[PDB]
Design a protein around this ligand. Structure first.
Ligand SMILES: CC(C)(CO)[C@@H](O)C(=O)NCCC(=O)O
Ligand SMILES: CC(C)(CO)[C@@H](O)C(=O)NCCC(=O)O
Ligand SMILES: [Cl-]
Ligand SMILES: [Cl-]
Ligand SMILES: [K+]
Ligand SMILES: [K+]
Lengths: 258, 248
């Protein structure tokens, strides 16, 4: 019998995956793009099923199915969705099912990773999302903002004079931010005014939300950060933080192995 | 009198000024398909135009001026190394937005002897740091509230598109949200407030001195209400800077 589960985290920007033998451990993992790209799965040991989080729409769903079937015909699979309660977490959304499935899995991962702690989970992807998670597993609410790269693109696409920086140039500007010292000053050129402005908006959101949460809950809150833009955001942060970049896949592993 | 035009990406603002410091009247309109009511205006001696909205807007503005005052003298205003007591710290001074430049000039005149942080809430949210001695030291550009919310609706599969009016009603409706529209309204608003607050605190820290935070042009009430730091509203900074340029 196979001891491994295939886990897929399809977001708006890319598709991440892992093969998990327990609720916490991955045998291997990787990522690919939505178009003209396919992962190396012909060397993988056959999984007992797939668990799929997809917030990228029906086209992506059909494409993921096509990839799974092209390797393991009729593999059992589960389309993961947020629900009222699962794996120690209870969903405080007014309509639990409307919470993003990625966010749900991340909550489950974080609950397991940091037992007994109040958390603010910050995940940097297409969007920047925040979730407040009590030590007793109650997800009490959250916030959504555009992510750094989306902010940058929005400015070029919706003003006459600001450049729409390319994917590669945006990556270069983000990497420059990740080389900055603390308390970076303002910029003296347009591309850096954009990069720093969008970064400071990210840092400002996270710090303001974290302080608000500690003050509301009257207890220490662990700020947990995830995602590509975290390296740059950490240079700007002054508040304590923890990095955990596998919360969503861990949550999927916990669901699969439950 | 001088006609002053502040054309941004979302709207064109204007004033009629009889000095560097006084407006006979003012107003605003959208690029298309609206137009200002200039029918009851005293004829101007010339126009001074800041335009960051592109060559097309520049054509609409010209046609508008020419329709009322054919071949009226006009001057396209651009950022430069130094003007009206302000010195431009940009590496390439002319690349600074002409609106930001005029706003700096207006701020230097309006709040003499003070270090300033100018926050302008338009299509983009901009910040400029301005020393009391007139040195513009640098700035930041982020998307505005509406742009942030629209970007999420247009560039994700599942999120809705929420306007400022809609978000304002939702937020008037622990410490975060339990549904998607409120989550994005609040997330984007708190990014706006957090940006400004963090920048102001960091600037006072860096300069070891008080800094007046000036909120330039209009700004959604929800943004202003959210701020926990002191601030001063000046809704006509750019136009007042244009009046100074025109009378210089
Ligand atoms: C916010 C995103 C886009 C982040 O990937 C995703 O979690 C999503 O589509 N969520 C649905 C709306 C919500 O979580 O309130
Ligand atoms: C940032 C905006 C769009 C604000 O209107 C405008 O000032 C502009 O196009 N600026 C040019 C780039 C800069 O000021 O660095
Ligand atoms: Cl608790
Ligand atoms: Cl956009
Ligand atoms: K552009
Ligand atoms: K959408």
């Amino acid at each position: 019998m196979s001891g491994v589960c295939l886990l897929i985290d399809a977001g708006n920007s890319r598709i991440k995956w892992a093969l998990a033998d327990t609720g916490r451990h991955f045998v291997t993992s990787g990522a690919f793009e939505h178009a003209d790209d396919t992962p190396d799965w012909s060397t993988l040991p056959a999984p007992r099923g797939a668990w799929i989080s997809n917030v990228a729409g029906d086209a992506a769903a059909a494409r993921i199915d096509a990839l799974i079937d092209a390797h393991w015909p009729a593999l059992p699979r589960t389309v993961v969705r947020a629900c009222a309660a699962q794996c120690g977490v209870t969903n405080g959304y007014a309509e639990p099912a409307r919470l993003g499935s990625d966010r749900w899995a991340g909550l489950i991962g974080a609950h397991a990773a940091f037992p007994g702690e109040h958390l603010l989970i910050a995940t940097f992807g297409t969007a920047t999302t925040l979730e407040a998670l009590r030590a007793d597993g109650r997800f009490t609410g959250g916030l959504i903002a555009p992510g750094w790269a989306l902010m940058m693109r929005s400015l070029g696409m919706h003003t006459a004079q600001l450049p729409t920086v390319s994917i590669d140039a945006a990556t270069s500007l983000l990497d420059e931010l990740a080389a900055n010292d603390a308390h970076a000053p303002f910029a003296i050129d347009t591309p850096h005014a954009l990069s720093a402005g969008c970064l400071q908006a990210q840092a400002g959101l996270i710090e303001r939300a974290w302080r608000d949460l500690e003050k509301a809950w009257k207890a220490p809150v662990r700020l947990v950060l995830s995602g590509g833009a975290a390296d740059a955001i950490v240079r700007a942060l002054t508040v304590p933080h923890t990095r955990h970049d596998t919360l969503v896949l861990t949550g999927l592993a916990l669901i699969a192995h439950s």
